[PDB]
Write an enzyme that holds these catalytic residues in place. Sequence first.
Site, short mmCIF file in Angstrom:
data_model
loop_
_atom_site.label_atom_id
_atom_site.label_comp_id
_atom_site.label_asym_id
_atom_site.label_seq_id
_atom_site.Cartn_x
_atom_site.Cartn_y
_atom_site.Cartn_z
N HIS A 68 0.95 -1.23 -0.11
CA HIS A 68 -0.14 -0.06 0.02
C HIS A 68 0.80 1.33 -0.24
O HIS A 68 0.74 2.20 0.94
CB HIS A 68 -1.15 -0.08 1.38
CG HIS A 68 -2.26 -1.05 1.04
ND1 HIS A 68 -1.89 -2.33 1.69
CD2 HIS A 68 -3.16 -1.15 0.10
CE1 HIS A 68 -3.03 -2.91 1.09
NE2 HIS A 68 -3.81 -2.23 0.39
N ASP A 107 -5.02 5.55 -1.51
CA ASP A 107 -4.55 4.79 -0.04
C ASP A 107 -3.59 5.78 0.55
O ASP A 107 -2.62 5.34 1.52
CB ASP A 107 -3.77 3.39 -0.63
CG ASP A 107 -4.93 2.30 -0.68
OD1 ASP A 107 -5.74 2.32 0.15
OD2 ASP A 107 -4.41 1.54 -1.60
N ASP A 217 -7.84 -0.90 -8.45
CA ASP A 217 -7.19 -1.04 -7.25
C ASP A 217 -6.72 -2.42 -7.55
O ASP A 217 -5.70 -2.72 -6.56
CB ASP A 217 -8.07 -1.02 -6.11
CG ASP A 217 -7.64 -0.90 -4.98
OD1 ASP A 217 -6.35 -0.55 -4.59
OD2 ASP A 217 -8.25 -0.87 -3.86
MG LIG Z 1 -7.08 0.74 0.16
ZN LIG Z 2 -5.31 0.40 -3.07
#
Ligand SMILES: [Mg+2]
Ligand SMILES: [Zn+2]
Length: 313
Positions: A68, A107, A217
């Site tokens: 992330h 994120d 994502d």
């Molecule tokens: Mg996320």
């Molecule tokens: Zn992500």
Amino acid sequence: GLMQFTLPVRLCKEIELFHFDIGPFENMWPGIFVYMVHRSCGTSCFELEKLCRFIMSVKKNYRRVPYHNWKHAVTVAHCMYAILQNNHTLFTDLERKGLLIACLCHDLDHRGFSNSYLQKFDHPLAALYSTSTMEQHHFSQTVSILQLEGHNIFSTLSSSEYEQVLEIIRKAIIATDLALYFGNRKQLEEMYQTGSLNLNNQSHRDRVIGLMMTACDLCSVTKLWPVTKLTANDIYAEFWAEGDEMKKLGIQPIPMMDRDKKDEVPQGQLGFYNAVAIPCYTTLTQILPPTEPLLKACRDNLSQWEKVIRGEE
Ligand SMILES: [Mg+2]
Ligand SMILES: [Zn+2]
Ligand SMILES: O=C(Nc1cnccc1C(=O)N1CCCC1)c1nc(C2CC2)ccc1Nc1cncnc1
């Protein structure tokens, strides 16, 4: 103003493909993103001086976690850039502006832990935001960086254009809460089969954009096998770290997150591609036919994980 960004030939060509990897050179990722904004939106749509200062503040607020991280932000932005370019006329000038920015910021300040872990640890962020914890925090951080002096890339929008784009970004970032994905895809599925899907209905766009955000994502599952395999290591580095922290709180973690149950990863990936990835890109290909390469790539990778189990690697 007449200051194009160009990429080396191989990047110039490969960057238009869904399965593009942005590479191991950190310092090129901002130019890559600017390149994407300019080709997707115009050389006009953001003052360069301000974009660059935004991009570098966003980089600064991603942490050095295995998955992330800043690399994930630009990988996810890239995929959204590919979708927008292969569905040119379906999206407003504003949607194109806000979606690339939403993906870059989706994120922000992630700590490498799930919403569940925050809730069982009892992290302050779980007090402040009861559902989509990290996702409401990510949107909160986006607005913070936008309010730093010389950081408002949206300065030139009318007041109403401004509330529209920040509302797109907010719904977009919230959509990346995979807990919301499942119902959102079920409704899009039902609406596409019964033919009531209508892209002039704003509540319908919102859902479609939500699925695009889920698609972008998860796009590490849509790369060449070697990229997918090595990214899977990063995602498992965070999962097992979190499992260690669950055990530290006196809680047996789900096996996904238990580094003792490393044997069961290939079956875990099967479950994931079947329960999440494959359905996601299917419904996305149905709504947006030009996104089929994501579905084809996802299937190859599902098949690659089947080979792992059958001891064929
Ligand atoms: Mg996320
Ligand atoms: Zn992500
Ligand atoms: O692998 C992932 N998840 C799982 C693994 N193993 C078991 C169960 C799951 C699981 O989350 N579910 C939910 C319901 C279905 C099972 C995974 N998760 C996520 C986010 C959901 C956090 C993102 C990517 C991912 N994969 C991956 C990414 N980039 C390259 N390669 C592989």
